[PDB]
Write a protein that binds this ligand. Structure first.
Ligand SMILES: Cc1nc(-c2ccc(OCCCCCN3CCN(c4ccnc(N)c4)C3=O)cc2)no1
Lengths: 297, 245, 58, 50, 58, 58
């Protein structure tokens, strides 16, 4: 029995998020209203205090004389679907005849969008993201030529046997998905759900995954959360013998049904590595351009 | 009304005369977890006084050639009080924070700081300078403690991102003509309802002077900077033996 | 459509209209979102708001 | 036709003299009234700003 | 059709009938226009009109 | 659909929804099954059940 008083008046057990703000609609920009001259004391919108860390609130009406303007300019193309749902390159897989990378007619690619910076710098504006996807595969020889060849793809989730060869038993794909496709056909294209254990893909993890005495030889696991490693993507030329033709495979990602959180700044230095925000130190270029004099253009 | 403020949580209390308004990070207050969002079945513990009070970390100095600092939360309190001695026992953790910063000066001094709160502030090394040499940051730069760690390249915040855009986060300034403190309140920012307190480090406080300190001789040169903070709505779960790290 | 609520946005307070053929809603189209905003979450998140005309510090 | 709005709300065409003041009669000097002592704060007629 | 009014003719005082599949109306068909004319805009734009029978200059 | 009941599940006590074009229902889609369980068929198949709290052997 809760007979004391400090337990009755307690704030413990509050599953509610006190929100000061509340969203509003805005299918168009704001309509500028009319104003006239004012010569009063006290009222003074220009003088702000920015130490508080809030933005200004002065407007065209309260600083100068305006007219009425009925703005019909939409705000629909600044949304996230209309900003992210545009395909871009995320990977490349080579299957050459004789080389050093992948000569035996198979290749494994670790699913990771962070290898090309047009698409990485768009997502790295946000921290947590929750999105479906739509991959697309474009196969071609180095010359762009199109050849009559059969190909197999296989999504290898975590904990599953990675194939070690072209004639392996992991290619029966009884439970894993797969995509047979030819090059004479159009690009392959499939859809993807949100596959994480968590509730969002975080592009930035500040911590270590495991416990232990973190020595210097195990600092390569800084910034590694396994709730983003969504597995592996395998590919091979179907057959028992080697192929007559080299090949290259390009992978495009298109995001849809997006939700984002946590705005944060944007990269200004060139990328170097993956899963790693490192920058060159002796080559810190400014954020932008420069000139000769503050008093002159 | 907007200048004078007081902050009473726990046994402790803070006053201030030349302050500004209070900020709520990302527009909402802390909270305890819902029975829908949560996943673990064990009943937490919620002390409500012994942990939710103001702790004072360490007192820096602000010279003219200073560059900046950062602190990682909630790493700062893992060896301090009944808070820390719960966070070692348990495995799961949830909390908010109130954050108060001090720097006083007379009416002849001048300067400005920027007091920002950035979630998931990964640190990045310089790649040997040439760019090719892959490196990684050591343990004393990612969890430096309560004694803080000093920046080397503050224009990029040591992560390839400018400081010019750090105001989009919950920020405040300390312009010594106007104010002398900055109060910031923050909820629990993570994709998961509970998460560890020792491995993971949810956000980092930054303090970077933009306009440098300056004065004239005969005036007091020592201009400290003190950092005060309080947990709020703290929960714990997964009891077992104490783990330092 | 007698399909499943597998999409990522299941649980959001906005309305979409989409086109689909397979039973799995993460294969649907992006569609149109609901047009809303909340700049006071990032620009004026203060506790005690102030008036435009009247000066903040008093 | 005055169909715009900045013409409707316009202050142009004002033949009126906004007068803050207004005359009053005074056939005699003012009659001094009675007073007593006061020991209050805030109220302070002596302190002016010229 | 629950599509957008992105077309160029959005704001004209004529009616069309079209066929479309995508959500963006500038991908629709041309269709049929409304059949109208106004030759007096280019042939007789005068201020004070005159009669056919009666001579103009009087 | 004026098709035949050739499918294998004709006679089960669950309901499906499917998509088909040919007249033979074994060419239809798999679809969605009815979500049910019966663990007491494999875990507690005893004749005289017992209570959680009270001990079994008495
Ligand atoms: C048949 C067949 N199926 C497929 C098929 C292949 C792959 C699929 O997964 C696509 C998931 C996309 C994952 C996108 N994310 C989320 C976080 N993250 C990273 C990565 C590296 N570092 C960080 N910090 C974050 C990243 O990269 C689905 C389907 N194709 O063939």
């Amino acid at each position: 029995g809760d007979r004391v008083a400090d337990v009755i008046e307690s704030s413990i057990g509050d599953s509610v998020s006190r929100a000061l703000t509340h969203a509003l609609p805005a299918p168009t920009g704001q309509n500028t209203q009319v104003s006239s001259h004012r010569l009063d004391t006290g009222k003074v919108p220009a003088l702000q205090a920015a130490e508080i860390g809030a933005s200004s609130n002065a407007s065209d009406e309260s600083m100068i004389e305006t007219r009425c303007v009925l703005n019909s300019h939409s705000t629909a193309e600044t949304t996230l679907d209309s900003f992210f749902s545009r395909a871009g390159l995320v990977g490349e897989i080579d299957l050459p005849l004789k080389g050093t990378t992948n000569p035996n007619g198979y290749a494994n690619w670790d699913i990771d969008i962070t290898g090309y910076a047009q698409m990485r710098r768009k997502v790295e504006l946000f921290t947590y993201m929750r999105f479906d996807a739509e991959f697309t595969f474009v196969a071609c020889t180095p010359t762009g030529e199109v050849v009559p060849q059969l190909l197999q793809y296989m999504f290898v989730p975590p904990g599953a046997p990675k194939p070690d060869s072209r004639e392996s038993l992991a290619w029966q794909t009884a439970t894993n998905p797969s995509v047979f496709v030819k090059l004479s056909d159009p690009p392959a294209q499939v859809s993807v759900p949100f596959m994480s254990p968590a509730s969002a893909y975080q592009w930035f993890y500040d911590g270590y995954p495991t416990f232990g005495e973190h020595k210097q030889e195990k600092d390569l696991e800084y910034g590694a959360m396994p709730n983003n490693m969504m597995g592996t993507f395998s590919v091979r030329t179907v057959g028992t013998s080697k192929s007559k033709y080299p090949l290259v495979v390009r992978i495009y990602m298109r995001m849809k049904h997006v939700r984002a959180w946590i705005p944060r700044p944007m990269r200004n230095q060139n990328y170097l590595f993956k899963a790693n925000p490192n920058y060159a130190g002796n080559s810190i270029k400014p954020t932008g351009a420069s000139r000769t004099a503050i008093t002159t253009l | 009304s907007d200048r004078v403020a007081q902050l009473t949580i726990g046994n402790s209390t803070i006053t201030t005369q030349e302050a500004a308004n209070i900020i709520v990070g990302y527009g909402e207050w802390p909270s305890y977890c819902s029975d829908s969002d949560a996943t673990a079945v064990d009943k937490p513990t919620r002390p409500d006084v012994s942990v939710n009070r103001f702790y004072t970390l360490d007192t820096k100095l602000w010279e003219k050639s200073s560059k900046g600092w950062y602190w990682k939360f909630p790493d700062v309190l893992t060896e301090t009080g009944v808070f820390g001695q719960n966070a070692q026992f348990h495995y799961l953790y949830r909390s908010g924070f109130c954050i108060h910063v001090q720097c006083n000066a007379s009416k002849f001094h001048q300067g400005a700081l920027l007091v920002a709160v950035l979630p998931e502030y990964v640190i990045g090394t310089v790649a040997g300078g040439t760019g090719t040499e892959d490196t990684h940051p050591p343990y004393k730069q990612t969890q430096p403690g309560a004694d803080g760690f000093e920046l080397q390249h503050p224009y990029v915040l040591d992560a390839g991102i400018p400081i010019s855009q750090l105001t989009v986060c919950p920020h405040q300034w300390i312009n010594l003509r106007t104010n002398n403190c900055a109060t910031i309140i923050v909820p629990y920012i993570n994709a998961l309802p509970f998460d560890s307190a020792l491995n993971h480090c949810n956000f980092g406080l930054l303090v970077v002077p933009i306009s440098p300190l300056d004065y004239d001789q005969g005036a007091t040169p020592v201009i400290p900077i003190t950092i005060t903070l309080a947990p709020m709505c703290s929960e714990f779960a997964g009891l077992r033996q104490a783990v330092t790290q | 459509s007698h399909e499943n609520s597998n999409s990522a946005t299941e649980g959001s307070t906005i309305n979409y209209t989409t086109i689909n053929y397979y039973k799995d809603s993460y294969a649907a189209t992006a569609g149109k979102q609901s047009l809303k905003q909340d700049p006071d979450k990032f620009a004026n998140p203060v506790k005690d708001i102030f008036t435009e005309m009247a000066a903040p510090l008093k």
